[PDB]
Amino acid sequence: EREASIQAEMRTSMQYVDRTVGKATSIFILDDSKFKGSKQGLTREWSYIGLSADGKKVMNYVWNKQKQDWDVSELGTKSLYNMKLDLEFKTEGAYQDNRLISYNLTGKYPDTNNKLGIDTAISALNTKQVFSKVAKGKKGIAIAYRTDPIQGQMNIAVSFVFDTSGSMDWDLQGRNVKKTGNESRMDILRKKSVIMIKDLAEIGNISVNLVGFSTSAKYIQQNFSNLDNGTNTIIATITKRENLNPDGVTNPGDGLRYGMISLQSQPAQLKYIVLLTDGIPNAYLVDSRALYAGNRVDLSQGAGRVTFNNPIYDLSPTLGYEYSRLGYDLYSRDSITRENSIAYAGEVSKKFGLGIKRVNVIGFSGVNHEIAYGQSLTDRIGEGGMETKYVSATNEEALQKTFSDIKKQIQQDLWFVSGP
Ligand SMILES: [Cl-]
Ligand SMILES: [Mg+2]
């Protein structure tokens, strides 16, 4: 009967873990790629709990800061008879507003096959910033944590790229705001992106600029405002009504070009495009090289479109517009022009998207067919190799939810990259 106090020792060890875990303000569950025992591999300023190399002790590497090292201490009180241990952590949903965690701490007795310990014990955490870095179907055998915030996070740049075509004067259902009573799409976009800015502000260390696009793109605010120095200057731009004035067609490639090149010139380590469009892509710019012979066919007066038989997209870092370089279809019905408009955005993404963490695309229309190429546009932008995500917002509160979700997801990239 050496069992009785081995089981008591494992339980007290687990209470030790739960005690120190209960004081953490951020938690990462780790698999054996970022913890092997040791201190070889430990990311600085993160404290850790996990099993020894020999697998026989539960230990706690605490961050020193003043000695800038780890204070290797065993969590527990006594030997365990050179027994080898199995330690596993797991998130397990929530109880009210608390996130749950499960602990496993077992091991078979010397040279018996009697399992000892706790197969699973549920506890609750005091932080909502609990993250998993367990790839694969790996087990997850260790934890990294902090008890005080991470001081000095990364910088984040967000380029907003907003459709300003003429359709943005109608209401979400595509009816005239004078005959219905509703706000215009642009009215709703102004309000809901002001909200999104104040929400982004809370993350801290986060700058934004504003690109408009319709027939072609324009910087509404070209340089990046840090919100920690004031929400004020950009909210003035978004709500000033000589700005974002609806007019033109839909040239998302050019908008994306302005967005991505301005992001390339920002130092931030997390970079984002938030692209909002309310219509079928129906415009693109060509390089001057494409102005030859019978390449440009001008059906503009009797069909409402100008197309290029062989488009060479305007991929220049020199940002310019000329009517002679414009492919477009005012009726958004010609399959070729639509294809060329979507492909332009993909070519722009491949050239200009190298540093970019994610492109979010928002289809913002209550009219089904106007956003029927939102996913298609996003997928083409995805050829540039970054993460992409398409969302449709068909009413005023879908948009505010999509904005909030995008904030929540940037906050989580930030947490995840500051992590161990
Ligand atoms: Cl998607
Ligand atoms: Mg439109």
Residue numbers in the entry: 42 to 461
What's written in the study?
Type IV pili (T4P) are functionally versatile filaments widespread in prokaryotes, composed of type IV pilins and assembled by conserved multiprotein machineries. We show that PilB is a modular pilin with a bulky module “grafted” onto a small pilin module, which directly mediates adhesion of S. sanguinis to host cells/proteins. PilB, one of the three minor pilins in S. sanguinis T4P, exhibits a canonical N-terminal class III signal peptide, the defining feature of type IV pilins. The larger size of PilB is due to the presence of a C-terminal domain readily detectable by bioinformatics, which belongs to the von Willebrand factor A–like domain superfamily (InterPro entry IPR036465).
The protein readily crystallized in multiple conditions, and after optimizing the best diffracting crystals, we collected a complete dataset on crystals forming in the space group P61. The pilin module exhibits a long N-terminal α-helix packed against, not one β-sheet as usual, but two consecutive β-sheets consisting of six and three β-strands respectively, which together form the globular head of the pilin. The vWA moiety of PilB adopts a canonical vWA fold, with a central β-sheet (composed of five parallel and one antiparallel β-strands) surrounded on both sides by a series of α-helices. As in eukaryotic vWA-containing proteins, PilB exhibits a MIDAS located on top of the central β-sheet. However, in contrast to these proteins, the MIDAS in PilB is flanked by two protruding “arms,” which is reminiscent of the RrgA adhesin from Streptococcus pneumoniae. The MIDAS motif in PilB, which is formed by residues conserved in vWA-containing proteins, noncontiguous in the sequence but in close proximity in the 3D structure, is functional since it coordinates a metal ion in the crystal. We have modeled the metal as Mg+2 because of its abundance in the growth medium and the high affinity of PilB for it. The Ser206, Ser208, Thr291, and Asp319 residues in the MIDAS motif of PilB form direct hydrogen bonds with the metal through oxygen atoms, while two additional coordination sites are provided by water molecules. However, PilB can only be accommodated at the tip of the filaments because the bulky vWA module sits on top of the pilin module in the PilB structure and essentially prevents other pilin subunits from being modeled above it.
